[PDB]
């Protein structure tokens, strides 16, 4: 049979929390991708064209995590690439075609299998121009990468060395198509919210009629990004030619306090479980009270670093305990109360 | 041999909404071939070479017109990319490779290659740029333009004889580029700004003065026809390069009428793709006439060309596709105009 | 360090140095410790021209992101320069610990 | 050329362009005609004019021979611009009022 989007989303839900829209988009794409892979013959006069995805979201939202979870559940080849390393042809940094090479390795150099593959290009917002203007200098690590990726996304034949470039002069480089390869470009666009505000939040003058929100009513990045359109991306630095290749624009919402509380315990590799495991191999049992998790979420939200903030709050609270816990003997359980997060109290210890 | 009417007819079958550009391409192609037949032309006067220059926004038929032309014509046709090209002796690529690929398409028939076409896409990407301190050297630029210029002006090009082995006997057969047709294209993003400054004097302030609003901004659509060689030079092209390309085929932005045709008229139209997708899933997909008009209006607003259509359709059917496999006993899906706006959700027949 | 594609040393060179310590044992290097000193010398110039690129400061931060978090980085054996058509030693930095440091000057004013 | 960055390379390129048309013949290239356009626009780019006049007065330029991946410094062809005729053009709209 074929995995349905509901099944795919459930597997993503095990590791990801709160990104419903993005999960739907990825599930639908993977299902459609499998449908095309099965109906390769396509006994009809219609070529099923792909739709590339563009993930946008703040830090610690779950973009890279979604891609990682997807790789675990993907039968077809999947590779993760970084746009930072890529450079336009003829430069020291790298060649865009390397991604495909990385993909072939996952497929044991089976071109037919690689063509029907998925690619996740992370940090796509870091190859963007500073303004809508075309350029002022050769932007190698920037628009140059976007210009190079156009053919790779739309579809073309890329050369690839099978084993080694130095084994033979030409080595009969492999020709692999990309018209069917799916691309998921994910980046945490910083400053895009400001661009959308200028286009949406009009009437921001000085008089009575002007509206002043005092950073309280102001819509957050999660709500603002939902209203993203291609014109906003052009101003951010993307090329119009590059967005057209990425029609599907999925947005991830900012993680709320309730979501952070869920992240601490519900996921498979939840933060609390990691610390519990660290203590468990040490012979100790770590218990987190519900009140503590609520406190950690409030503190982490202030950092504005996403879910990663949680690690800072937890590590800081357990720093003193982890330092002197091995020296201590006969300690079997550790309890963290709400006061411990504030720093007023010391974590309670159980001996036995 | 081919007639311009025939060329335009074949192009219209696959391209929609570029009537003027198709005319210019057909006229230029026909005239170029007639020039090759009558080399002497029984006259001392020499006709200027007609090399097309395609300028149009994203998703307007630039890379499609070239492909459709190749399908019709029998002569060789190669589709290169300026992004890959680099200055000689660099890792990226060489310009001579273009002729090499052209011969491979023509089965190494030098006589046939000299009568071939060459399409260079993304030509705007090699635009001249100011020197960067950190970069070692700017190879993907002016240098490439000069190589293409010497190729367009007409010069012999050495191609290896099929690369039989390490030593190919150094035959290095010569190929003449004086009779080759070049079609340089690319969306000159930011050219509208240069043109605007040149041809716009602003607005007045008095009563009699004609105040111009944003709706009268005169964007790229209808603003690229006024382009002159001075604007291209500011964009980064070489003056001599422009002179070699007298023909300038401009593609206007796709109107709503053209977009609606693209949704249904093509054999591999967007609507047909989703219908096939649903059909292999045991479901029938129906698109209402009003829905197509709404999709085109949204796509036109995006200013992404015809590619925008996929974005609109994908969003409308995102929820339906997510829960259609789980839904059972569903044989037909109907999309109304409201579904595109999002107020309603698409009627599903449970029969 | 500098952003990829420029004349300065690349960010993957760090891993190369680590390989030297481990006799080019990738499995032994993936579990190493790394100390990046002078991390305050790579910082965005808030008041700067918009159209420009801070290859030295912002680019380095951008590049280190996947490295710190963890990725399968390409590591030239020697590490002098990156060449696209060159053999690379794939290293995973998901288990490598990083200890960045730096005397932030003017932070007391910001606080 | 108004950019005023690495003007020596830009002005030298002019000579390189002439050699390509000249078939890399130093004697024939030295007899060539160079036409410069929009010379009025640079006026106000003093540095641009200074670089140009050195080329107009006459100097020896090093041009790489027949391209090549890498070639030694000495191999570079030495052409003299003192023997090359330079024509400078341009429209001077404001100049009429000045007169």
């Amino acid at each position: 049979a074929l995995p349905t989007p509901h099944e795919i989303r459930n597997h993503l839900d095990d590791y990801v929390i709160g990104q419903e829209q993005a999960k739907k988009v990825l599930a639908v794409a993977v299902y459609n991708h499998y449908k095309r892979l099965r109906n390769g013959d396509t006994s009809n006069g219609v070529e099923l064209g792909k739709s590339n995805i563009l993930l946008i979201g703040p830090t610690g939202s779950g973009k890279t995590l979604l891609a990682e979870t997807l790789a675990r559940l993907l039968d077809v080849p999947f590779t993760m690439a970084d746009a930072t390393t890529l450079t336009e042809a003829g430069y020291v940094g790298e060649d865009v075609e390397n991604i495909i090479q990385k993909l072939l390795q996952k497929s044991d150099y089976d071109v037919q299998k690689a063509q029907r593959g998925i690619v996740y290009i992370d940090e796509i917002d870091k190859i963007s121009r500073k303004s809508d203007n075309p350029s002022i200098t050769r932007d190698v690590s920037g628009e140059g990468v976007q210009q190079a990726l156009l053919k790779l996304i739309e579809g073309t034949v890329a050369a690839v060395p099978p084993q080694g470039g130095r084994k033979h002069p030409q080595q009969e480089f492999l020709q692999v198509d990309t018209s069917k390869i799916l691309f998921i470009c994910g980046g945490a666009f910083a400053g895009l919210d400001k661009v959308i505000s200028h286009r949406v939040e009009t009437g921001s003058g000085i008089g009575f009629g002007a509206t002043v929100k005092a950073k309280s009513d102001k819509a957050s990045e999660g709500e603002l990004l939902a209203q993203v359109e291609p014109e906003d991306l052009i101003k951010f630095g993307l090329i119009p030619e590059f967005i057209g290749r990425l029609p599907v624009v999925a947005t991830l919402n900012e993680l709320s306090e309730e979501a952070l509380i869920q992240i601490l315990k519900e996921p498979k590799n939840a933060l609390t479980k990691q610390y519990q495991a660290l203590f468990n191999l040490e012979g100790v049992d770590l218990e987190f009270r519900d009140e503590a998790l609520d406190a950690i979420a409030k503190k982490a939200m202030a950092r504005k670093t996403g879910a990663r903030g949680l690690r800072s709050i937890v590590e800081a609270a357990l720093l003193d305990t982890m330092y002197d816990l091995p020296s201590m003997e006969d300690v079997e359980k550790v309890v963290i109360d709400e006061s411990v997060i504030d720093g007023q109290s010391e974590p309670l210890l159980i001996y036995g | 041999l081919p007639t311009p009417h025939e060329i335009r007819n074949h192009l219209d079958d696959y391209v929609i909404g570029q009537e003027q550009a198709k005319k210019v391409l057909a006229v230029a192609v026909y005239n170029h071939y007639k020039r090759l037949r009558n080399g002497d032309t029984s006259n001392g006067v020499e006709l200027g070479k007609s090399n097309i220059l395609l300028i149009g926004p994203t998703g307007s038929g630039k890379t499609l017109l070239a492909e459709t032309l190749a399908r019709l014509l029998d002569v060789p046709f190669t589709m290169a990319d300026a992004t890959t090209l680099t200055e000689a002796g660099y890792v990226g690529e060489d310009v001579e490779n273009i002729i090499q690929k052209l011969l491979q398409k023509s089965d190494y028939d030098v006589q046939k290659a000299q009568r071939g076409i060459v399409y260079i896409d993304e030509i705007d990407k090699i635009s001249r740029k100011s020197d960067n301190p950190s970069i070692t050297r700017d190879v993907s630029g002016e240098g490439v333009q000069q190589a293409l210029l010497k190729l367009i002006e007409g010069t012999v090009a050495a191609v290896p004889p099929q690369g039989g082995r390490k030593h190919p006997q150094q035959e290095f057969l010569q190929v003449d580029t004086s009779k080759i047709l070049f079609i340089c294209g690319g969306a000159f993003a930011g050219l509208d700004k240069v043109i605007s400054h040149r041809v716009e004097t602003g607005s007045g302030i008095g009563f009699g003065a004609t105040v111009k609003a944003k709706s009268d901004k005169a964007s790229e659509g209808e603003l690229l026809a006024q382009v002159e060689p001075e604007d291209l030079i500011k964009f980064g092209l070489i003056p001599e390069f422009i002179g070699r390309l007298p023909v300038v085929a401009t593609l206007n932005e796709l109107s709503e009428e053209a977009l609606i045709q693209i949704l249904k008229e093509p054999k591999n139209a967007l609507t047909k793709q989703y219908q096939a997708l649903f059909n292999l899933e045991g479901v029938d997909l129906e698109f209402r006439d009003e829905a197509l008009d709404a999709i085109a209006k949204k796509a036109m607003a995006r200013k992404t060309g015809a590619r925008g259509l996929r974005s609109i359709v994908e969003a409308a059917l995102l929820d339906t596709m997510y829960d259609l496999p789980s839904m059972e006993d569903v044989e037909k899906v109907v999309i109304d105009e409201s579904v595109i706006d999002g107020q309603s959700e698409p009627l599903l027949i449970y029969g | 360090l500098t952003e990829a594609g420029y004349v300065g040393e690349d960010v993957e060179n760090i891993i190369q140095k680590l390989l030297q310590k481990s006799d080019y044992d990738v499995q032994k290097a993936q579990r190493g410790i790394v100390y990046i000193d002078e991390i305050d010398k790579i910082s965005r110039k808030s008041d700067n021209p918009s159209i420009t690129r801070d290859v030295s400061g912002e680019g380095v931060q951008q590049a280190l992101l996947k490295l710190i978090e963890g990725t399968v980085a390409a590591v030239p054996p020697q590490g002098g320069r990156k060449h696209p058509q060159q053999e690379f030693l794939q290293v995973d930095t998901s288990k490598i610990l990083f200890i960045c440091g730096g005397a932030f000057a003017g932070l007391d004013k910001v606080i | 050329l108004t950019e005023a960055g690495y003007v020596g390379e830009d002005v030298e390129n002019i000579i390189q362009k002439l050699l390509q048309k000249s078939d890399y013949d130093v004697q024939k290239a030295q007899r060539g005609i160079v036409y410069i356009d929009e010379i009025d626009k640079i006026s106000r780019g003093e540095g641009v004019q200074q670089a140009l006049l050195k080329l107009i007065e006459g100097t020896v330029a090093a041009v790489p021979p027949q391209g090549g991946r890498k070639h030694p410094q000495q191999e570079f062809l030495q052409v003299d611009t003192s023997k090359i005729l330079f024509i400078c053009g341009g429209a001077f709209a404001g100049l009429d009022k000045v007169i």
Partner: peptide
């Protein structure tokens, strides 16, 4: 069999 130059 060295590689080509890179900027």
């Amino acid at each position: 069999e060295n590689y080509a130059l890179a900027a």
